[PDB]
Amino acid sequence: NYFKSLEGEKKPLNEVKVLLVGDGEAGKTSLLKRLLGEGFDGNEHQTQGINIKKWGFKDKDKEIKVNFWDFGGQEIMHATHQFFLSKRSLYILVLDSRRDEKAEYWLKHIRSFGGDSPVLVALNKIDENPSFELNRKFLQEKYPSIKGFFRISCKEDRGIEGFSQKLKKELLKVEHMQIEWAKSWFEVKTKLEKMSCNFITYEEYRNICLEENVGDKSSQNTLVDFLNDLGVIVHFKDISLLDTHVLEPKWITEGVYKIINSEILAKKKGVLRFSMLDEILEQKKEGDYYYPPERYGYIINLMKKFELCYSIDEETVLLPDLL
Numbered sequence: 001n002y003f004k005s006l007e008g009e010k011k012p013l014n015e016v017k018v019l020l021v022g023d024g025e026a027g028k029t030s031l032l033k034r035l036l037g038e039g040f041d042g043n044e045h046q047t048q049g050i051n052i053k054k055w056g057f058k059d060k061d062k063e064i065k066v067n068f069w070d071f072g073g074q075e076i077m078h079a080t081h082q083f084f085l086s087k088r089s090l091y092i093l094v095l096d097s098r099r100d101e102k103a104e105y106w107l108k109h110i111r112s113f114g115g116d117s118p119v120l121v122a123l124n125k126i127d128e129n130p131s132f133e134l135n136r137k138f139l140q141e142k143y144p145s146i147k148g149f150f151r152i153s154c155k156e157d158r159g160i161e162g163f164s165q166k167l168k169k170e171l172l173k174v175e176h177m178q179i180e181w182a183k184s185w186f187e188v189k190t191k192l193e194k195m196s197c198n199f200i201t202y203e204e205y206r207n208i209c210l211e212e213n214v215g216d217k218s219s220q221n222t223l224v225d226f227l228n229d230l231g232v233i234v235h236f237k238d239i240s241l242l243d244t245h246v247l248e249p250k251w252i253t254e255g256v257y258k259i260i261n262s263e264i265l266a267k268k269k270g271v272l273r274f275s276m277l278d279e280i281l282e283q284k285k286e287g288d289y290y291y292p293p294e295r296y297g298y299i300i301n302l303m304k305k306f307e308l309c310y311s312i313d314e315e316t317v318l319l320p321d322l323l
C-alpha cells in the first residue's frame, strides 16, 4: 500500500444546487413537478415548507446530478430562504402577471447572493394572462447571469419541454461541472448525506475528514465551501456562525419561526432578551428540534446577518414587525 498511496484517482463532481425562487403562489412548486414529470392537480399550494428533490439525467457518458431546492410560503414571507442562497449554483426565477413587475427586485436579490450563478426566468401562468411580458433586452444586459426567458403554463403544460431543454444545457455549462475531486472528498460527502443529525460542530467535521484521507486544514476548508454550495450542509464563515454545520435545513427555520411566532414575544412589542430563549426554544412536544444553549448565539447572529433582527444592546434584539 505504502508505495502506491501518495496520489489519487480524481472523478468529476457533476453536482449543482438548483434554487427555485420567486414570490409565493407564483409557480415554483408547480414548475418543479413538471420538471420531474409529476403532473398538475391544482392543489400544490397545500405543499409547503422546505422541499429538496434530488434529480438526475445522463448526458452522453456523464451522470448529471441535480439538487432542487423549493422554498415554501413561510420561507419567502419571513425571508428565511436567504440562509440557503449560495454561489456556484443555478437559479430559476418564477414570475406571474398579478404581481406587476417584481422581477428586477428578485434579480438584484439573486445577484447579491448568487454571484456568477446563471439565472433562468420563468414567466408562469400565461393561460391566466397571455399578454404578460418583460423588457428582456434591458434585463439580460443589466443582469448578464440571465440565460433565457420562458413563457410557460404549469396548468396547461405549455413551454415546459423548451424550458427543460435549456435547463439541461445550462446545467452542463456551470463552472464547477468540469471541476474534479479526490475519492476521499466524495467519501466525506456521502458520509454527511447519510447522517441524520441536525448539525455537527467544526471539531466533528475535522474528525470525519481525518477518518478519510484528507487531514490538512487547507483541503478541509475548500471542501466545506463546496458542500455548502452543493447543499449538503449549510455553513457560514463568520466567526460567530462557523462552528455550526447544519445538516437539516428545517432545524434552522423552525428555530427562527418559534422566535417570530412566539406569543411571549408578541407582548413586550418584540423585545427579545436572551434569557427568554429558554422558554421559546424549549422542547414542548411532538418531535420539536433540540436547540442547545450554545447554538442560541448561532440563531440570533444568523437572524442578525440577514436583517431579520436588529440589536438594541449586547443582551437584547428587536423584532420590528411585532413592535
Ligand SMILES: Nc1nc2c(ncn2[C@@H]2O[C@H](COP(=O)(O)OP(=O)(O)O)[C@@H](O)[C@H]2O)c(=O)[nH]1
Binding pocket: 023, 024, 025, 026, 027, 028, 029, 030, 031, 041, 042, 043, 044, 045, 046, 071, 072, 073, 124, 125, 126, 127, 128, 152, 153, 154, 155, 156
Ligand atoms: N392557472 C394556472 N395555475 C397555476 C399555474 N401554476 C401554478 N398554478 C396554481 O397557482 C397556485 C401557485 O402555487 P404553487 O406554484 O403550488 O406554490 P408556490 O409558487 O411555490 O408558492 C397553485 O394553486 C397552483 O395550482 C399555472 O401555470 N397556471
Ligand SMILES: [Mg+2]
Binding pocket: 025, 028, 029, 045, 047, 048, 071, 072, 073
Ligand atoms: Mg410553494
